[PDB]
Write a protein that binds this ligand. Structure first.
Ligand SMILES: *[C@@H]1O[C@H](CO)[C@@H](O)[C@H](O)[C@H]1NC(C)=O
Ligand SMILES: *[C@@H]1O[C@H](CO)[C@@H](O)[C@H](O)[C@H]1NC(C)=O
Ligand SMILES: *[C@@H]1O[C@H](CO)[C@@H](O)[C@H](O)[C@H]1NC(C)=O
Ligand SMILES: *[C@@H]1O[C@H](CO)[C@@H](O)[C@H](O)[C@H]1NC(C)=O
Ligand SMILES: *[C@@H]1O[C@H](CO)[C@@H](O)[C@H](O)[C@H]1NC(C)=O
Ligand SMILES: *[C@@H]1O[C@H](CO)[C@@H](O)[C@H](O)[C@H]1NC(C)=O
Ligand SMILES: *[C@@H]1O[C@H](CO)[C@@H](O)[C@H](O)[C@H]1NC(C)=O
Ligand SMILES: *[C@@H]1O[C@H](CO)[C@@H](O)[C@H](O)[C@H]1NC(C)=O
Ligand SMILES: *[C@@H]1O[C@H](CO)[C@@H](O)[C@H](O)[C@H]1NC(C)=O
Ligand SMILES: *[C@@H]1O[C@H](CO)[C@@H](O)[C@H](O)[C@H]1NC(C)=O
Lengths: 732, 738
DNA sequence: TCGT
DNA sequence: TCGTT
DNA sequence: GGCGTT
DNA sequence: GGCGTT
């Protein structure tokens, strides 16, 4: 048997008891190797009471997760109140414990904890008071999280109280988080060891040097969202009061090690120069959701922030307005360490050579985020002069892998016809995203002429008219072309289309024609020497193959094709005819979510290199009508989510090379070894879950091959008899 | 028991044996009232052999459908060959038989048939020869169908042979259809009684008066697709040979009663005036898929077609080209009986005052079809001057500038065009317009009340599948009569993370009754409260009310202000939970609530008390495991309850009892093991629909539920075939009456 | 099947 | 939450 | 106490 | 003879 039923043993002594609806902590059998357990996860069970005996026998337990077990009223889906009781020696009985998560539990005080504890989450609990006695002897504690104990989702009448010097005994505390606690001031006398202090979304409306006293090791400080602009809030929000916030000039001046500072959503119309005196080595500055729209056009403060790597200016928009132009201050020219600049959501209508003048010669600038700005005029040629750009986001505007390569995102804009003069000075560009535009154009080879280095072009969710024979031929390096969800042209009854351009793309490897509703009046034969993968899912190959033999050889000419996706093609039948005229190079064939109630298994002989077959989500009633044929090179077979009620003995036997097999979500009543014969030893994945198994033969088979059966402990389920229906096969 | 198991008795003596996989015709029990059967449907069974005994006891059988029983190789899904044998007195033993369908069966000759036969389908069979002997004594036969016996889907080596005068003995034959038979000429000496003759998609490449000799009663004639233009074909197609077709001037001149004539796909570059001489009654003329693009600009032939009601000129396009303009001949102003003119697929780029000049004064013209033309400039103001237009189709074009039925009202379809911003000057002179379709365009615009100003009579506006920015407070306020507004599938703006939206315009539309905000993905940063005095129905399906209701109490009263709302659709809203909170703050006027395809695994049934006027509740496609946790509450006025496609495994006794007014109940596609009368109590007599199909019912010997379902059999749909066993195996997936 |  | 205040 | 994959 | 809602 598996050792820790009803939970699952994972590698490295990791026990998973998540989502088992347990009312108390399982102590397991004494025959189980309890000392081997280093991690115990009990996420989202119904344990409302913990006891001295619950973890004592787990001699080497290091991580313990009791999250979501007894959620407070506001966080409960049904608003059920919950109070969790904990006996005094519950966690003291585990002197090896290093990581404890008690979040989303209705506890009202901190329990007694062992001196070994390194990490502690008390977030989203009912603890309203922290004090000196609560953290006695916890000298190893590095991380303390207690977010969300007083806000709209987990309310309290007043606020979280952190007693002065309550945490001061925690000598090794580096990370402290106290967000969403209704705090009106920074807690007094925090540990000097802190490098990360997070106080965001409280109402700390004034600051001063004494509020951050003796915190000279501080590397990251988040005091953002403490007096907010609720015109931008998606959640409940109190408006920043008039004449606030009030930050004393010298508030941050003693924080010499500070790398990151978050001042987002603090209703700031300007910055004080004094705040950043002594923060010359600041690397990250978040100024998002403020009112700095005018400040950034004229400020001189970036001359003193020369080490800055990331600068977030996003959603610094003026209420009720967008600007005609937005010209950045000259001082941005001094940010020579700058790698990432976020300018999304400022709202401005024109992007010109003046806009980003100051940034043009910054030697290390890689990312530039200009999305969601209502830009309707964009001079795209400006980006050619930049020395180091890898990513420009101009998505979600009104203009009319690709990791580590120069990529331009123009998705979700109002482009209707592409003109080549758009792309002048962008010959270095390797990836271009034009998805979710409105491009309806008989594209013909004169649209992308300047893009001589382009390897990836995403034109999904457009209305492109595939007709002219030289489409995309002006892109010599083009390797990947996404033309999915351009269905509207293919729904024009009586107006046909031409896909002969595919043959003229000499280095194309990936093509998607997915979800186009291709059903009639189209080229009879696709061809390509280069193409490796074609996604043709979400079309009507059914209708096409019903038009006599017009489309019998539609894929034939893709003579080096390795992957073909024919999922969601309304296919009720699939003949030897059709499979024989697929390219003989084919290794992976996907046929998910078709209408196949029958499949001639002997016809798989015609696909000599087929390794992976996906028939998931069809309506097969059985695995019979001839077995899998001899000499087949098949490795993966997915027949899950069918209605398979029985399997002929010796069905899988002849598939020597078979490795993965998914029989899940079927109508199987048993799991018989005669189906696989010799394959039972060779198989590495045998999914048999979500089947109505008759629980009274199969248990000894599954236990013998238990390493190959995923979710054996919990997911492999009985269908009969009642009393065991829907429950694990090991409940008896 | 139901009388004709395993088939179903329907009203009017109609027995349905379709799709039962029967290898022979069922004779039924002798206790069954065999004489009551007037219609027997056996569609798509596996009956390859018919016998003298099969229908003899059906003394009053009038209709018999044996379609798809033994499909020929080409029509078989797996290309299995099939030959159907028929004993001599199979149909003679039914002397009352009037309607016989033998289509999609591999028969090679016509069987012996009773003299009572009125209608006969031999379409898609293996009959390659019709002859004099085949129709002996069939004097009552009015309809003969035999389409598709020689073409790509049902091939023969040569063609269907119709012997001269083979059908001449059929004295009452009115309708004859012989499409897709590879015929090279009209069959000789057809019956003079014919009013409808259909010969489309053969290869009758020449015609003459003698080909249609003595057919003076002919009302409809289809000779279209007989020499085709395969550049437009979606199916296998042979090109019209050079110098063809060859129609003699006087071919149709003796057909005085002809109302409809189909000359589509005949590769005609012009018409002959002589063809229409003596066609004084001609009401319908189909000229589609020809090469008449130049002919229609200058022809004078429409001066002699003054009785014509429908004229189809669609797909008269010039190969490889579209035209800059298209100016119709002056003679179109002469078609004074014309009601419908179809001009889709000609391909022309500009629509002006000149284009349709000739049509402007035609007094009865209702429909004008200009779709699929690649038009990029359209002067829409021209349509105001027309006296009788009800429908103008300008859909699927390239135009970019200057729900109630709409069937009997002036409607303009501009859907599937390239409009990005709407300018009011588009709609000048269209103040009479009552319905406007702008769906599947690319409209991305902060619409604000200055876009539709001329449309003073507009009641219905479809803006679905666009990218409209709902923000300004006066959107659509310039439409005073606006009753129905579809803003569904405008989701992209609502996916702009951090850019919020404003739906306060809904309150400013004083006569709005229907609104759709469906499939918009509305999830955050939106107006907290919708309001309207007038609104009756709101489709809010396909959004994330789940996310909205998870933001504290911001959207707690989101629907509250719709104070006269009768229908609310909250389907596909990702709702895992549904509290008393949320239902209490819906409008108390609400009568129909739809919650299909949400994520509801639990439902507090007692909270239905808070919706006092609720009559229809749709919870189909959720994940309810049982009907329990309190029963339906007392005084509930509920009439329809749909909890189908859940995982309901049991029902607490007395669950439905308190719902006095309950009429329809859908429990189908669940995990129910029985059907217990204690669930309903007194309701069992009251219920009019009780769907219990696709449930894994436990069919034990003397199972409780069979006597309950039989007692209430009029209320249970698909009882004969669809009500199914789940256990034990050997009965699994089969009928409860096996 | 979209200015040959 | 998009030329206001 | 029930609810739910956050 | 089997397949399949045409
Ligand atoms: C937070 O503090 C305010 C002001 O003292 C108080 O009114 C409110 O009740 C407190 N709690 C919450 C959950 O907002
Ligand atoms: C920006 O582009 C314009 C138009 O080509 C040009 O006149 C101007 O010199 C360019 N540079 C600057 C710094 O304005
Ligand atoms: C695309 O169309 C334009 C306009 O007709 C033409 O000038 C151009 O040569 C075409 N491009 C190609 C590559 O044929
Ligand atoms: C598709 O285009 C190519 C080249 O433009 C042409 O040779 C081919 O015949 C076209 N297809 C059809 C169906 O006309
Ligand atoms: C099954 O496939 C084999 C081999 O391709 C072929 O001989 C046979 O005709 C097929 N049978 C059916 C029923 O389709
Ligand atoms: C139709 O007849 C032609 C010529 O008489 C012949 O070539 C062909 O075999 C027939 N076509 C079909 C589809 O039966
Ligand atoms: C259409 O007209 C009919 C009768 O004239 C009327 O019943 C109906 O209300 C009208 N519908 C619209 C949407 O204008
Ligand atoms: C709508 O917006 C346009 C452009 O900003 C403006 O001209 C017009 O006055 C606005 N309409 C109304 C009704 O205010
Ligand atoms: C929506 O617009 C109305 C009037 O234009 C305004 O009163 C209301 O505050 C707006 N909604 C939001 C969320 O600002
Ligand atoms: C009950 O629901 C099913 C789908 O779940 C549907 O097929 C059926 O039509 C419904 N019953 C009635 C009587 O309409």
């Amino acid at each position: 048997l598996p050792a820790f039923l009803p939970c699952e043993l994972q590698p490295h002594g990791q026990v998973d008891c998540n989502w088992l609806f347990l009312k108390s902590v399982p102590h397991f059998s004494a025959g189980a190797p309890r000392a081997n357990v280093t991690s115990l996860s009990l996420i989202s069970n119904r344990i409302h009471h913990l006891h001295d005996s619950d973890f004592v026998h787990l001699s080497n337990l290091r991580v313990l997760n009791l999250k979501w077990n007894c959620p407070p009223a506001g966080l409960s889906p049904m608003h059920f109140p919950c109070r969790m009781t904990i006996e005094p020696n519950t966690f003291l009985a585990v002197p090896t414990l290093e990581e404890l998560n008690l979040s989303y539990n209705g506890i009202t005080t901190v329990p007694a904890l062992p001196s070994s504890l390194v990490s502690l989450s008390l977030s989203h609990t009912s603890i309203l008071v922290l004090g000196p006695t609560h953290f006695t002897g916890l000298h190893a504690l590095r991380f303390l999280y207690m977010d969300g104990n007083c806000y709209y989702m987990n309310p309290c009448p007043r606020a979280l109280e952190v007693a002065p010097g309550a945490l001061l005994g925690l000598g090794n505390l580096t990370h402290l988080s106290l967000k969403y606690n209704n705090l009106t001031e920074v807690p007094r006398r925090l540990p000097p060891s802190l490098d990360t202090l997070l106080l965001s979304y409280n109402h700390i409306v004034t600051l001063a040097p004494e509020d951050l006293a003796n915190l000279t090791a501080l590397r990251v400080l988040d005091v953002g969202g403490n007096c907010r602009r609720c015109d931008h809030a998606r959640n409940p929000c109190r408006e920043c009061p008039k004449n606030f916030p009030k930050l004393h000039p010298d508030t941050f001046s003693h924080l010499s090690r500070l790398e990151g500072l978050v001042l987002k959503d603090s209703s700031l119309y300007k910055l004080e120069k004094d705040w950043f005196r002594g923060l010359g080595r600041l690397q990250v500055l978040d100024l998002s959701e403020n009112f700095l729209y005018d400040y950034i056009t004229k400020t001189t403060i970036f001359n003193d922030l020369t080490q800055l790597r990331r600068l977030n200016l996003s959603f610094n928009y003026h209420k009720k307005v967008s600007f005609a132009h937005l010209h950045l201050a000259s001082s941005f020219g001094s940010l020579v360490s700058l790698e990432k600049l976020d300018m999304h959501g400022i709202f401005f209508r024109s992007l010109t050579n003046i806009t980003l003048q100051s940034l043009t010669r910054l030697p290390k600038l890689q990312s530039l985020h200009l999305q969601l700005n209502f830009i309707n005029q964009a001079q795209l040629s400006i980006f050619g002069a930049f020395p180091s750009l890898l990513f420009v986001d101009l998505s979600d505007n009104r203009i009319s892998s690709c990791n580590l390569n120069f990529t331009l995102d123009l998705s979700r804009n109002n482009l209707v016809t592409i003109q080549q003069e758009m792309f002048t000075r962008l010959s270095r560009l390797q990836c271009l995203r034009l998805s979710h535009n409105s491009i309806s154009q008989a594209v013909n080879g004169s649209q992308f002429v300047p893009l001589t280095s382009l390897r990836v072009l995403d034109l999904s969710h457009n209305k492109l008219d595939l007709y002219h024979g030289r489409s995309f031929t002006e892109l010599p390096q083009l390797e990947a072309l996404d033309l999915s969800y351009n269905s509207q042209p293919f729904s024009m009854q009586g107006v046909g289309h031409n896909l002969s351009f595919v043959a003229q793309l000499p280095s194309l490897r990936y093509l998607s024609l997915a979800h186009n509703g291709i059903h009639s009046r189209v080229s009879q034969k696709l061809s390509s020497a280069s193409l490796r993968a074609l996604d043709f899912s979400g079309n009507s190959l059914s209708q096409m193959w019903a038009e006599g033999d017009l489309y019998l050889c539609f894929f034939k000419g893709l003579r080096n094709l390795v992957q073909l996706d024919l999922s969601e093609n309304h296919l009720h039948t699939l003949l030897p005819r059709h499979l024989d005229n697929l390219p003989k190079s084919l290794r992976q064939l996907r046929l998910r979510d078709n209408n196949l109630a029958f499949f001639n298994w002997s016809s798989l002989t015609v696909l000599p290199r087929l390794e992976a077959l996906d028939l998931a989500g069809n309506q097969l009633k059985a695995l019979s009508n001839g077995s899998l044929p001899p000499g087949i090179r098949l490795q993966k077979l997915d027949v899950s989510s069918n209605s398979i009620g029985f399997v002929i003995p010796g069905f899988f036997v002849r598939a020597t090379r078979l490795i993965e097999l998914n029989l899940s979500a079927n109508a199987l009543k048993t799991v018989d070894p005669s189906w696989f014969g010799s394959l039972a030893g060779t198989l590495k994945i045998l999914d048999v879950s979500a089947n109505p198994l008759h629980c009274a033969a199969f248990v000894d088979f599954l236990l013998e091959r238990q390493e190959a059966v995923p979710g054996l402990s919990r997911r492999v389920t009985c269908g009969s008899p009642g009393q065991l229906q829907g429950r694990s096969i090991f409940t008896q």
